[PDB]
Every structure is written in C-alpha cells, then in structure tokens.
Design an enzyme around this catalytic site. Sequence first.
Site, PDB file in Angstrom:
ATOM      1  N   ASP A   1      82.917  12.341  25.902  1.00 55.84           N
ATOM      2  CA  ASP A   1      84.153  12.062  26.568  1.00 55.84           C
ATOM      3  C   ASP A   1      85.045  13.030  25.712  1.00 55.84           C
ATOM      4  O   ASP A   1      85.021  13.407  24.739  1.00 55.84           O
ATOM      5  CB  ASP A   1      84.482  10.638  26.524  1.00 55.84           C
ATOM      6  CG  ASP A   1      85.773  10.563  27.013  1.00 55.84           C
ATOM      7  OD1 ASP A   1      86.209  10.997  28.154  1.00 55.84           O
ATOM      8  OD2 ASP A   1      86.578   9.676  26.464  1.00 55.84           O
TER       9      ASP A   1
ATOM     10  N   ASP B   1      89.402  12.575  26.138  1.00 56.43           N
ATOM     11  CA  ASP B   1      90.547  11.710  25.708  1.00 56.43           C
ATOM     12  C   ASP B   1      90.112  10.302  24.628  1.00 56.43           C
ATOM     13  O   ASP B   1      89.509   9.476  25.365  1.00 56.43           O
ATOM     14  CB  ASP B   1      91.562  11.265  26.791  1.00 56.43           C
ATOM     15  CG  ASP B   1      92.361  12.639  27.117  1.00 56.43           C
ATOM     16  OD1 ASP B   1      92.383  13.454  26.351  1.00 56.43           O
ATOM     17  OD2 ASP B   1      92.838  12.768  28.301  1.00 56.43           O
TER      18      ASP B   1
ATOM     19  N   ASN C   1      91.833  -2.230  28.999  1.00 57.88           N
ATOM     20  CA  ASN C   1      90.727  -1.715  28.203  1.00 57.88           C
ATOM     21  C   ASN C   1      90.817  -0.523  27.334  1.00 57.88           C
ATOM     22  O   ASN C   1      89.979  -0.465  26.445  1.00 57.88           O
ATOM     23  CB  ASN C   1      89.543  -1.607  29.193  1.00 57.88           C
ATOM     24  CG  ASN C   1      88.444  -2.760  29.137  1.00 57.88           C
ATOM     25  OD1 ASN C   1      88.477  -3.299  28.209  1.00 57.88           O
ATOM     26  ND2 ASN C   1      87.694  -2.911  30.248  1.00 57.88           N
TER      27      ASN C   1
END
EC number: 3.1.3.5
Lengths: 470, 470
Positions: free
Chosen positions: A50, A52, A152
């Site tokens: 991933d 960011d 989250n």
Amino acid sequence: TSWSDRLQNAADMPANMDKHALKKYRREAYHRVFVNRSLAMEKIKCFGFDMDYTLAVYKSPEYESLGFELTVERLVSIGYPQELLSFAYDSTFPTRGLVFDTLYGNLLKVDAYGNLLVCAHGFNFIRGPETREQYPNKFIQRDDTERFYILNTLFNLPETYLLACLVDFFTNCPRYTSCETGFKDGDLFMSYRSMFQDVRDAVDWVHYKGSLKEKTVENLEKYVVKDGKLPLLLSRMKEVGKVFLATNSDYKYTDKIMTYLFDFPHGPKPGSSHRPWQSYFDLILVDARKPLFFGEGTVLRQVDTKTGKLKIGTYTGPLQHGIVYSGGSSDTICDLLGAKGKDILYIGDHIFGDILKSKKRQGWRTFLVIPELAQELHVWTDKSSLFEELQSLDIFLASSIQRRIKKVTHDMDMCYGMMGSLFRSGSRQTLFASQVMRYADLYAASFINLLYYPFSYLFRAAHVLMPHES
Amino acid sequence: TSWSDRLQNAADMPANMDKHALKKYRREAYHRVFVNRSLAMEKIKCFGFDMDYTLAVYKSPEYESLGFELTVERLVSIGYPQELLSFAYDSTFPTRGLVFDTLYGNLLKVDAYGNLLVCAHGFNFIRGPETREQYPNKFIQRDDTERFYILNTLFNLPETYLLACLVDFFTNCPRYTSCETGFKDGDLFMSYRSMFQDVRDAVDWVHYKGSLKEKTVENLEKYVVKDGKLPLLLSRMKEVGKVFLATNSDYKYTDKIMTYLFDFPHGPKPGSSHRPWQSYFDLILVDARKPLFFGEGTVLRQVDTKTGKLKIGTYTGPLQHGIVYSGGSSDTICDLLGAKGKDILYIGDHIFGDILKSKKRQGWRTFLVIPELAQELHVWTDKSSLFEELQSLDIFLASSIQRRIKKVTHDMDMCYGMMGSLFRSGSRQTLFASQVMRYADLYAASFINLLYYPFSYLFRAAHVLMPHES
Ligand SMILES: [Mg+2]
Ligand SMILES: [Mg+2]
C-alpha cells in the site's frame, strides 16, 4: 514527540548492514517485526505494498491539523456556524479505531465483543452507571453498520476530534436545544447521523475536490516522512522475489508522492545511481478500490502515464515493462505475477481494507504497519510499572482494590492521550488489538523493520492450545 | 466406548455434594468446566438452555445410525439407486465441523483461515500436492455459503458420512461417468451440489415429515442419555436466579423429551417428590428459530399446551405461570425476565446458532456443550506422548524431520477417527476449535459439570497480551 517524530528520527539513520549490527538493532522493540503467526520468509515470492500511511507516512500532528482545518472550512462554506473556525486540532484527544454512534452522538472505545471501554459525548466522558441509560448492556452490535462507524485509519483522526468538537459545540451553544438524537434550532432538526454524514462528506471532499493534496505536495518535507533506506529494502526484496504496488490512490498523486519518497541523490545505497520509483516494482496498480479489489474488483484499465488519464477501454493485454494498471482485482496480481496467495506478503496500514480482507478473502500473508506503535512502544516501556501494578491488583482481587484498579487504569490510559492506547484500556484489549492479532501475521511500527532480518528468516509464534489441551 | 457411553457412565453416578468431594471431582478433565474468558458466576441472573444435544444428548452411534438409515431410505424412495440400501453407518469416519465443497464434492477439514488440513473425495484422502489442482492456494473462502456447507452439529454426522458414501458409490459404479463437478448417467447430469441438496432435504424431511421422532420416542432409553443429577442442578440454579428454555424444537417433541429427562421416582434429589419438567423453568420458549431469534426473531405466539397447537394470534400479554411461548426473540426473554445480556448464561451445543450469534448479536454469556469432548479427553490424555513428540519435532525443525512430522500427525489423528480430532489435525487447530475459543466463554463435555462448582465461583482465564506487550 509524536510517533512521526520517532519514525523520522529512525528514517534519518543510514543502514548499517553488518550482520551483527542488524541483529542488535532488531532486538529493540522500535525496530522489531512482531509475529502473530509463524511465517517462513523463504516462502514469500511477492512483496506487495500500500502507499498512504504505509510507504508514505504523513507527519503528525501537521497533516491531521491540515485535514482538520480544511474539513472545518468546507463545513463552514456549506453553512455550518462560524464558531467552527475557532476550533483547532488537538492531537491529545483522538485515538484511532474509535466507533461513532450516529444515533446518540457518542465516541466509543470498545473491545472485540462490543463491550464499552470508554464513552465520550463531546468532551464529556460518561462513566459506567450513566452509560447504561443509552447502552443497557454496556454493549454495541458493531456490525450494525447503518448505526456505528469505525474510525479505522489515520485519515480518520481529524474527523474523530471534529465530531467531538461539534457535539461539544452544539450542546453548549444556547442557540440549539439538545435532544436524544441531535439538536433543534427552531424549525431545523440536525440529527447526529446527518451531522456525521456532513463530516464524512466534507472529509472525502477535501481529499477529492478540495485543496488538501495540492497543499500536501507543495510542502512534502513538512507533511511526509522520507527514508533513504526504502530503496535499499525494495531492491533487496527484488533480488529474491517480485515487488508490487496496489494502492487506492490515483496515478498523478501516487507519482508525486512516490517520486518524493525516492528523491535522494542515490539509488538503493549511497554512491549508486538514482533510479525512478517505478523501476523498483514488477507491477504497479492504482485506483485499486480495496477491499472490493479482493473480491470482484473492477474492470482492469491501463494508465496513460504521460497524461495521467486512463486509456479508453478494458486492458486485455499482457504484463509489459512500463505498464501501469488501474482497478482490476487481486486475481490480476496473482495471474500476472504467477503467484498464489500464500506466496504473497501484503504490507499495509488499513486493518480492514488491506489486512482482514486480503487474509479472509484470498489467504494472502499479511504485514500490518502501525505508525503510532513508534510512540506507543515508548509509553509502554516508560510506564510499564503502572501496567505491572494493574496486573498485580487484578490477581490480588482474584472494595478499595476495585477503586484502585479504576484509578490505575485511568492513570495508565491518560499517558497515551484522552482516548488511551490504540491497543487497550487498562487490562482490556480493544477491538483494534484483537483484529491485529487475528488478521495481521506480522506487524511493526514501520515496514522498514523487514530490512533488519535476513532473506530466509523464520518469524516464529508459539502454538495456541485450548484450555482442555493445557 | 463412544462419547455418549462416557456421558451415560457419569450420568449413572449419584451426586455427592460434600464440598471436598466436589472440588476433587471437578479437577478431573471429564467433570471440569473449561474457561476461555473469565466469568463471575455471582453476576449471572438467568440460566438459559437449549434442548437437543444440550439437555437431551442422543446416544452414539445408535442415533446417528437411525438418522442415516432413514435418510438413505428417503433418498431411495425418491429414486436414488438401490445400492444405497447396502450402506451402513460408520462412526469411525465422520468428525463434526467438516466443510462440504458442493462444487467439487470434497469433505474438507479446515483451520480458522480456510487452510486445508484434510481433503477427502469419497473415502479417498487427497494429499497436499494433488489438492492444488482444485485448491491452488490450499485455501477456501468459507463465507462463500452458496458453495461451502459447514456440518456444524451432531445432527450432521449421518449426512457427513452419507455424502462420502455417495461420492464413493457414484465414482466407482460403472453406470456413471465422473466429471469435475458431478456424475453423468446418460442424458441425466447430477452435480455434487444437487446431490448435496437432496441429502440435506432428505435429512430435514426425516426429522420433520418422516419417522425419526416417532422411533426416537418409542425407545428413549436406547436413544437418549438420562441423568438423575439434572433436576438437582436446575433446582440449585433456580435458588440463585431464573431458569429458561429456548429451543428450536416444537412443543410436542420438547414435552416428550423433557418428560423423559425428568422421569425418575424423585424430584431434585432422591427422597423428594417428583415435579413436572415445566416447574424447573421460569420461562419456556419453543419454535425459537435460532439464530434469527437473536435478531428480529418471529412473532411471539402462545402454545395451547393441552393440544400442542399454537393459539391464533400474537400473544400480547404478560409472563404468567404455566404459559408456554413460541417464536419471539431474545428480547422477549430479556424483557420478561428483567435481564440484560451479561446477566444471562446461555447453554447450548450449536457453535453458530446458539453461541456465536448470542455472543455477537446480544452480548450474552455463553457456555458451549461439546458432547464428543467426553471421549476426546480420553484420547488426548491416553495419546499425549504423540502430541508431545510432535511439539518437540516442531521446535527441533525450527528432511527426515518433515516426514516424521507428517507421520506422527497421521498417527495422532487416526486415534480419533478417519477425519481426526474435532479440535485439530496435528499441531494445527480447526475452525471449530478457534470458534470455541473466541465465542464460548465456558465449555465442557456436559452442562452438568456446573453442578460441581459453588454458587459464586469465579471462572478464571489469563489475560491475553499482544506480541509487543510481552
Ligand atoms: Mg493506506
Ligand atoms: Mg442443540
């Protein structure tokens, strides 16, 4: 000293690859990779990332403050009261993974079973007996997703604080009358749910249609952690396997951030020629739409990297050098890299969208990056005496002891912030902690901690036994 | 010696309530209540029960054999081949909690992550490399409920074996041609899915429209474990709290079974007057439709206990003495007994429908009855040397060791049956074991083991720590 300060201090250090230096460094909790389930690194054929809050960790509290300020300005511009402009982001308030109850306007910290650990209405922390009016069993049904929103990601820190600011503001402003489920202002009724939706919409808007990205990219040094060791790790991964990027960000933003992350006068190590960020990846995929990506996904598209626009049509061709993908599914990755799920280690920060979903839907191996761990580890060790005390009291209890337990729990929690540790409230683990243990095979303050382990390292975790098996 | 033989041997013993006798008895694994999460018994205000395989444990293998025989006869009667009549139930084959893959016709034993531990096609056990053709990542997505069926209850033991018998039969009968997804018989194609559906339908039919219940009730001593200690435990529970029944069975069948369970020449203890089974319950609810019961449930009805029919209309009245309810929801129970979820201990054998759902949807405290534990405990202790060996090998490995590990795993598993322990395959825990640990606060071979603990006993489990907290 924030968690990003810790991360940047470590990022500033050059890699000493002397094998004894490496072993010593990774013994420090800060530089360690933590293990929930055993994982033989020699079996990993593909390393996926991933972007960011994984590769590009935004600096705290500056980035949260920017998101907050722009979100507030968006709300004012659509007609929220001017007093919002007097709010200022406060990093000591929010902890990640809180639940907003849209019916009653409360932020909740819960355990894995939906039991209430903390309940705040604005900045009013509601103690046990008072929570029973609204939560008769001190319990929420967390999969009631129409009612409860779980905050989250680190992108949700600004809105966590903003929700509390807003509830506090309306509650205490004599223009408004407080009701069970929102605020009355004459002939206008604003429910906590419609308020929450406005906040959520304004956050999305600031990222998508507003000036957040532009302000980020105009001062990347202020907003983004940068580390000369990143190309070293990626180049080592590429010596034993394949490396891919699968990110929800679009091509233009990914290109700006990624260029900055590799912008050193050298490539993998000092003295080596600089290479473009794209050369470190066998496959680059943007607009991933995780977690949908891990089921049906979307139509596979090809990015025209010159314009940053998608080419017209579904891409039906092969993996070629220089190609950049958009959308698709996790099956695109497996098919193009010749991989099965358990040959893949996927590295991300989104406990739901990156980790839980790739694990449950696909059987991928998982590595969770938890940026706040960089500073939670410091508090954990520095305040260990408070946790130990609590552990001794709990055992002694099995009264003035019960009150002592509540007081020590409070003192311990306050060391982390107003909403306590990401991982616990006293001796009770949060939902987030339980999800980490169940779905993240490996986790760490930074993915960079993999650099400190050799190529065929076996990460070990003890076997779990049932109570009757002990 | 089956698990029901063990249960009946213990049921035959009178209760010695001498407090020292009690402490000694509950130290034996067989008579112990096992603890996943701490539970203070003094906080339990209501004790709720399931009936079938909880209060009424059916004797093994006789009851499974009866279900099997009747299911086979139903399939033959709808046109399945006559060779089915030559099948005979074999208790050594099925283990509970297996997954039937309706696409490929395989029984699978999986862990909590969908990883394949065992794969059998008929009676052919497929080893690792061969499973990769159909399961390239040796993994199933278990929530793909259209494809995978989890055989979670002791009612599913007969059909677990029958599915294997059928696949074996069609595979080896030269009238049929085997394809990837089923069997061709000239111009007729029978998929494993439509076959599975026929089995599932025939099982339901035998219980609902066939002769199974009638044959059970005509020889209850042959088919049902009976225990003079049951009224003792229930009467003690009623001294400190409320007692309820919430069962999926209908009134007439519940009344027959329950009458038999209380049919002794005494009430709670020898010398006391016999009382009707209904007098031990503050609330009796039938046709519960769990797990739907734990969400919206159904319309609350009143049973006419004279005829066994439902009265016409929704019951809108109060809890009255002698009333019997049908349908409703778990909220009916909380409202009528003045209880919140955490004041309730619900006792059942259905890991999904009784335990997971009451825990997740309602925050009830849970006690899982695992009847096979009565005999798995014997194997566990008797063959402990094989498990210990495996534990030593796993540690030594961290080759002839790898082959030794596979051989010991096989030898250990075979001690339980062809599909191994309910709880593991070698050192790998099953999905069922992981669900037990996560959702059942307490578990035991029998709910009767609660009799051996005092009124305000604190069941203790150690706190869980994350890897970075250790
Ligand atoms: Mg991310
Ligand atoms: Mg049952």
